[PDB]
Design a protein around this nucleic acid. Structure first.
Lengths: 155, 78, 96, 23, 60, 125, 206
RNA sequence: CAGGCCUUGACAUGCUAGGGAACCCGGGUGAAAGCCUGGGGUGCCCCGCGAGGGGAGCCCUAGCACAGGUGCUGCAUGGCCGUCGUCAGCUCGUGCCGUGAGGUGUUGGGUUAAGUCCCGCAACGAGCGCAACCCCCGCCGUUAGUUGCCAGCGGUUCGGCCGGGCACUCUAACGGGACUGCCCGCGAAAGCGGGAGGAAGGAGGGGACGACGUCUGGUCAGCAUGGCCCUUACGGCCUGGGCGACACACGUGCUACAAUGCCCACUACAAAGCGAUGCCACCCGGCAACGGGGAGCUAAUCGCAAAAAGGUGGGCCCAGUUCGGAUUGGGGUCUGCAACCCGACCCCAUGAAGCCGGAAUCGCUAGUAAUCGCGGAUCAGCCAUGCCGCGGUGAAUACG
């Protein structure tokens, strides 16, 4: 996309809750294409959002997204002969991808036995303020603003 | 079932050991299997350049001919 | 069962409407042109004489099968189709 | 997996049978 | 060793393993297509001249 | 008696008969839920029944051949979105605007000579 | 090297095969082995005549052995003399019922392989090679042509440094499939090495 | 390469002296080659009852004119391929400016993927190039039905099995269709944004096709080819070795380091092809590789054939492990004359590294990458993890 704007693909809803952001997390839970295995691990762990802390698997997910989505990020740019990390607002589309991705990583790293077990846990804790993706979101955000010295070094 | 020894050598062999056990049979048959009559002789086997002799014993009966006169010269590297 | 083999279809499809058209005028009652799934043999070849594995090309051998049946046989049917229009490259077959 | 012959996945990749994958 | 070689493929010798596909217009030992009787470069230049019965250049 | 819809999607063949009534579903001689067990893309081509509210206007008989499990599924999606615009040619309204018509030419590509799997190019220096 | 053979491109797009027959797994190599054998006898002792193509057809021990040619007499002689002793030498190896044939070439100055082995013979004759390519091309447009193109490759005139001589008055759109262009190649072996010679006649669309 | 042989040779044409021819079987030896050697006996055009003959296939010896050489030279070559580079270029004709090299066109403003088109202009045309015609796929039809089919009825031993039928599915030929053609927006035009209808819109996806040329690119070892050089050897046959050697060094890859995993049972859903001294249904024997017996197919009707993943539900429980399959020992099979060097396949046992990798680096934009199995070629067999294909599940992201 030197030329064009690089087409943003919509996703399907998910047959189970009809949510285009539930397909977007399951795709990032995916591995080797084996999506049938990618989909259990949600509803395997959605069930773990329901068993433990009896609530709403629909809504604990959708909060855990907004509880890891970073409004300010820093990317390094070259000026003078310097490597200044530039303060910038990470766009909403970048957010979705950013939110979901840390959410898989932080979860995969967890010391729990089954995959979904972690997945649920993380989602729970993200909305609760204390996850692994939630550190990373604050890390980037306060990495920015620590760098507001480079705010007009933004495009 | 199946054991292979050329039979140009086992012809001499069962003619040599029979007609007074000598030794020193030169051959180009390392494909043969050292059948148990060969026991106690001296076959000069061809590795490609040289006819390395072997003193045949019991310690190696069901064994082949060409393991017993290796084709390659090693000694070392350095 | 008049199993018509061949390489070229346009020559093979002029004579399988020939023993189709002509036996109907000479008896009864011509099974229309049936086309079997063509059996393909390919040849992928290193274009250059030497090394150049990166660059090759694709050649294929398309030998398309064609069957056609005669329903009510008759005489004059195998004597109208005893002497038949060729072409230089078409395969025949007789059965019943 | 596919290099451990003495199992199911090992014979398949290989194109073989025996005990751990029979016919 | 080359021509006296191609003669040696024409005369089956001591065993049935010992035969191989040499070539005809090529004296070529390798990449011998036995259906065609032709040796990958034999094959290709005659495929372009059309001296090969209904052998198309693919494209799919 | 029936309503018929031709379905394909990437080397798949799904022949449907929207024989009216309750809503029970057989493909290749068993309940949709028996054949398509495990699969979560398996709920499904019954979704075109959700674009014209007709979960309770049609049982189904289907025959299917080709591709795979979830590749057959998208065939019946063209096979159920066609068997409804056939019944009521005024029901493509909320079918093509809802995008359940058409047939996806999203086919697996010819492997290229040189590139190890169509495009996955060899590693170089 | 980077160009496709303008013929093998059109084998069923414009032009056509020169052993137009059928076979399979059992007998494919042997009738075809014969074809080249046929072409060896027929490309030798049918040279000093013309000869631009050989269309060959098979049946069930009926090999048709048809010649395209510039001058027919050098195939049949007088009364019928040579076309019969050619239908005596060929129908020996071919093992079957031959049929040594002739069809006369409507202006051999539009047949490209003729356009070729003419101009390349003029190389072994040690002529002005350059002026021959301008010549042989010139002739062909002069006798009904939409385009032509000739290329001479090697010790041009003999000179140690290996050149590529080149000429093309008139359109030749090789990138087209419905382009109808005849092509042939001529091999002028000289006092100093082998020279390549090409031929490319745009005959019209389709 | 080592050892043992043959000289007009393994092959060609031709001429000459003696046999003589064909052709099939031995004997002796030798690793094999080769060497020496004991048998039968030639149609034919033939004076001819005959002795016997002439000539001629095919053979031998001798002697040549010659062969043969993967020996050298890819800067003496052809041809073919690699490459920049699917990149948008590179040129002529005449006219014109310039003493000339040369320029002008082809540059510029606008737009495409593009020298894509539009407009301007000392320029006006023209070619090779892009595109188009070709294939494949995606929608629909005509033609056609021993492949499909209770979609339809009957019968169904219940296998589309019989009838019976072409509507399907499928097969494979010819056709149809997209044209910025219709509207809206803007633009001098071309053209861009957006709309509808449409199976698919703006090259719909891929293939094939790759300009004048460049790299004194690559191949004399596919082949041919100028020359140099070797002609009881740089020819040639043969047996055995080497091409597989191992202190190390780098490229492409395979399988991993596990639990989104492995293991075991059982259960589903492809596509492309290939199948006669072949694919081998099915029984019997074997833990098995395999070994018997044995049915069918010139193959849309028999066979390879299992797809795998997946799904079900049980085993494992974080263990260098039921992770991982190296190594070695032993017993086995199959191909093949022959598996010491050097084959694969099988059974048991041995179960090493490796707990995700420094500096560095490669691939890929949608059905792509990832992941999974299947064929084919060459091939007796095989050292394929390679290559050329095929389809199954199926993403991530693109401010610039």
């Amino acid at each position: 996309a030197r030329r064009r704007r690089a087409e943003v693909r919509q996703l399907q809803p998910d047959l189970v809750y009809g949510d285009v952001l539930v397909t977007a997390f399951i795709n990032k839970i995916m591995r080797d294409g084996k999506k049938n295995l990618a989909a259990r691990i949600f509803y395997d762990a959605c069930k773990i959002i329901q068993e433990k802390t009896g609530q709403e698997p629909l809504k604990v997910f959708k909060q855990a997204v907004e509880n890891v989505k970073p409004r300010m990020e820093v990317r390094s740019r070259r000026v003078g002969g310097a490597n200044y990390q530039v303060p910038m607002e990470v766009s909403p589309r970048r957010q979705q991808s950013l939110a979901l991705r840390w959410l898989v990583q932080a979860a995969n790293q967890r010391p729990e036995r089954r995959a979904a077990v972690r997945i649920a846990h993380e989602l729970m804790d993200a909305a609760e303020g204390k996850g692994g993706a939630v550190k990373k979101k604050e890390d980037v955000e306060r990495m920015a603003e620590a760098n507001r010295a480079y705010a007009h070094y933004r495009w | 079932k199946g054991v292979f020894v050329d039979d140009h050598l086992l012809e001499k062999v069962l003619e040599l050991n029979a007609k007074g056990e000598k030794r020193l049979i030169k051959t180009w048959s390392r494909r043969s299997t050292i059948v148990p009559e060969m026991v106690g002789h001296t076959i000069a086997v061809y590795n490609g350049k040289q006819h390395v002799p072997v003193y045949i014993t019991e310690n190696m009966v069901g064994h082949k001919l060409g393991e017993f006169a290796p084709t390659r010269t090693y000694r070392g590297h350095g | 069962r008049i199993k018509l083999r061949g390489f070229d279809h346009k020559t093979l499809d002029a004579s399988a409407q020939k023993i189709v058209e002509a036996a109907r005028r000479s008896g009864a009652q011509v099974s229309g042109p049936i086309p079997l799934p063509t059996r393909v043999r390919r040849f992928t070849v290193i274009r250059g004489p030497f090394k150049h594995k990166d660059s090759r090309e694709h050649f294929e051998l398309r030998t398309h099968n064609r069957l056609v049946d005669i329903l009510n046989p008759n005489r004059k049917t195998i004597e109208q189709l005893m002497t038949l229009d060729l072409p230089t490259g078409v395969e025949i077959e007789i059965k019943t | 997996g596919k290099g451990d012959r003495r199992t199911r996945r090992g014979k398949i990749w290989r194109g073989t049978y025996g005990k751990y994958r029979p016919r | 060793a080359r021509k006296a070689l191609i003669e040696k493929a024409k005369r089956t010798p001591k065993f049935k393993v010992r035969a191989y596909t040499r070539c005809v217009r090529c004296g070529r030992a390798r990449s011998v297509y036995r259906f065609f009787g032709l040796c990958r470069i034999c094959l290709r230049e005659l495929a372009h001249k059309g001296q090969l019965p209904g052998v198309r250049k693919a494209s799919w | 008696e029936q309503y018929y819809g031709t379905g394909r999607r990437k080397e798949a063949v799904a022949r449907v008969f929207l024989r009216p009534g309750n809503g029970k579903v057989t493909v290749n001689g068993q309940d949709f839920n028996e054949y398509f067990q495990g699969l979560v893309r398996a709920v499904a081509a019954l979704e075109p029944l959700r674009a014209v509210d007709a979960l309770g206007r049609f049982d189904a008989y289907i025959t299917v051949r080709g591709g795979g499990k979830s590749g057959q599924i998208d065939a019946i999606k063209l096979g159920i979105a066609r068997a409804l615009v056939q019944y009521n040619p005024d029901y493509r309204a909320k079918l093509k605007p809802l995008g359940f018509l058409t047939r996806d030419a999203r086919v697996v590509e010819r492997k290229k000579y040189g590139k190890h799997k169509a495009r996955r190019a060899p590693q170089y220096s | 090297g980077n160009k496709i053979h303008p013929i093998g491109f059109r084998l069923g797009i414009t032009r056509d095969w020169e052993s137009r027959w059928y076979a399979g797994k059992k007998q494919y190599r042997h009738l075809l082995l014969e074809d080249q054998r046929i072409r060896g006898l027929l490309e030798k002792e049918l040279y000093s005549a013309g000869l631009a193509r050989v269309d060959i057809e098979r049946a069930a021990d009926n090999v048709a052995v048809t010649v395209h040619v510039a001058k027919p007499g050098v195939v049949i002689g007088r009364g019928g003399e040579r076309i019969r002793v050619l239908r005596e030498e060929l129908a020996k190896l071919t093992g079957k019922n031959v049929a040594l044939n002739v069809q006369e070439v409507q202006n051999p100055n539009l047949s490209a392989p003729l356009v070729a082995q003419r101009v390349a013979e003029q190389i072994e004759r040690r002529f002005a090679v350059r002026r021959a390519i301008k010549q042989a091309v010139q002739r062909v447009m002069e006798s009904g042509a939409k385009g032509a193109k000739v290329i001479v490759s090697g010790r041009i005139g003999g000179a140690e440094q290996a050149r590529t001589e080149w000429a093309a008055q008139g359109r030749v759109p090789l990138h087209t499939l419905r382009a109808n262009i005849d092509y042939g190649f001529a091999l002028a072996r000289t006092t100093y090495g082998v020279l390549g010679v090409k031929a490319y006649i745009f005959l019209g669309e389709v």
